[PDB]
Design a protein around this ligand. Structure first.
Ligand SMILES: O=[N+]([O-])c1ccc2nn[nH]c2c1
Ligand SMILES: O=[N+]([O-])c1ccc2nn[nH]c2c1
Lengths: 301, 301
């Protein structure tokens, strides 16, 4: 089956990517499909905070190491995250109330992960899901204890740890241009970058319902108006996996000069976090679905 | 769907189990099927040596902790392994040439894992795949460096770490009573048990091709002739998933008084290590397959 990564590279983009991990690569047909058809891998779970630092200073890198090794042996790009995120956050972190302690705990978590893989990771999602739906900053432990400068500190710490990685902020429900969360993140990123914060990218965690593809054609250009060097579409899946929805998201990428690529959130439907909505590009028999073929067609023209 | 675990408990057995791990329980329909239909879980990868001790004395428990917690919350039995195995073995272990050092490394690995989950684990696979196909002992780093006492030492150490747990040796290609490996593990286990080695169980890692189920009716009673308190069928899958092959394996279990239960190597076909042979009991849409219903009927007759 024709490679969507090759085709999107031929249209001037960097990658078509997919989330995976060790036990995906040793089961099913996932390794063969990724080798043939995708240009970048992301860790489905193995770089999250509760997988990598379940207790203070007790780092667990076996899973992440496997993925990074596999990607290098097979000539794929590699992304990483979530470095700073309130979900799947171990209790030992959320129980901290001292500002200096939490600051150093955050800095050490960022520095340790990025150092280990220094120079091998194209992009890191440094901070994720930092905004409320009304556009105010989400009141996580980091905001409550450190304050609003936790985002500047995180990005400056990450830039120091690996200056070769592109540093992203990411969030979800950025899929419509009239939604308050979309314009808020644009405005805050503008202001942070004007003050010298090294935010290289905005990543849009794109979990869509049927029919919401079309809206990304006007949301993604808006996200790009923040002036970051890059934007990306991340963790993509679409309930029903209609070709129309998937083609609209791909075309939004193509229409936006700074959008470097697209990452789908898994290979085959039965391995999706919402498998009953069959929202991915390959079915339970690892056959390409009509949406995969529609994307190929769209990219060929 | 009717629960094969409830039905096999009704026939006087302990469990019908499945291998799983954290990212299976958060994707597909695996958690719901396990909750409804299976009585025991085993770690697909999270307790192997490369996952738990990737550098000497530095242990990684995030993935294993998740599985143990989930099982306790949902009222399921838990198994564990492999403690001593030549595959998925970090290179820091396989490069040790000193007998004392390797003995202590092996004992520390066993003792640390078993102590952490002391009293919570029904059975541990202490030693796996220790035999060659001709019935001689496999020349692994443990055999080359420590000698054949490594198996006695492993079991003695395991018994002291958690006396509640059932201790197993396991291997594959024990599916034919006339195959030399089958008689060889019987010979050795009888000798070890006569020397007081605490081997509670032989686990048969049952990876079958079409038509091989019938032979297990003779092989499993032969394995039981070693006199261990228990035997089990583990990591079960069958190319083609013929009802006749699966029912023959279940009936071998039922016929052998010391056989405590059966564990299948995953829930749904696309998540198998040999998915193209569709060898499991649920298909790529998470529907029970003919073999599942045939097992249900067999357990009710
Ligand atoms: O795009 N992605 O599928 C993806 C998956 C996991 C991640 N963790 N951090 N960023 C991620 C992106
Ligand atoms: O029964 N099993 O499927 C199973 C899976 C993994 C294991 N590791 N040790 N024993 C195991 C059994």
């Amino acid at each position: 089956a024709q490679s969507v990564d090759q085709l999107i590279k031929a249209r001037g983009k960097v990658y078509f990517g997919v989330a995976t991990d060790q036990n995906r690569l040793t089961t099913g047909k996932n390794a063969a499909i990724i080798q043939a058809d995708f240009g970048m891998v992301w860790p489905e779970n193995s770089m999250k905070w509760d997988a990598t630092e379940p207790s203070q200073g007790n780092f667990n890198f076996a899973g992440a190491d496997y993925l990074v090794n596999w990607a290098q042996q097979n000539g794929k790009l590699i992304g990483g995250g979530m470095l700073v995120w309130h979900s799947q956050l171990p209790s030992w972190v959320s129980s901290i109330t001292d500002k200096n302690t939490l600051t150093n705990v955050m800095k050490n978590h960022i520095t340790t992960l990025m150092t280990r893989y220094k120079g091998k990771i194209r992009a890191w999602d440094v901070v994720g899901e930092a905004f409320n739906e009304d556009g105010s900053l989400r009141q996580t432990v980091f905001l409550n204890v450190i304050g609003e400068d936790y985002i500047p500190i995180a990005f400056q710490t990450a830039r120091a740890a690996d200056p070769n990685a592109k540093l992203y902020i990411m969030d979800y429900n950025l899929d419509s241009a009239s939604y308050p969360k979309t314009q808020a993140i644009v405005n805050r990123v503008k202001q942070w970058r004007a003050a010298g914060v090294p935010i290289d990218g905005i990543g849009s965690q794109t979990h869509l319902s049927a029919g919401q593809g079309a809206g990304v054609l006007q949301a993604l250009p808006l996200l790009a108006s923040a002036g970051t060097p890059e934007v990306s579409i991340l963790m993509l899946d679409v309930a029903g996996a209609s070709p129309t929805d998937y083609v609209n998201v791909v075309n939004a990428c193509l229409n936006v000069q700074s959008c470097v690529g697209i990452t789908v959130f898994g290979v085959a439907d039965p391995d999706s976090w919402r498998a009953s909505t069959t929202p991915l590009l390959f079915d339970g028999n690892f056959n390409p679905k009509p949406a995969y073929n529609a994307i190929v067609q769209d990219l060929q023209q």
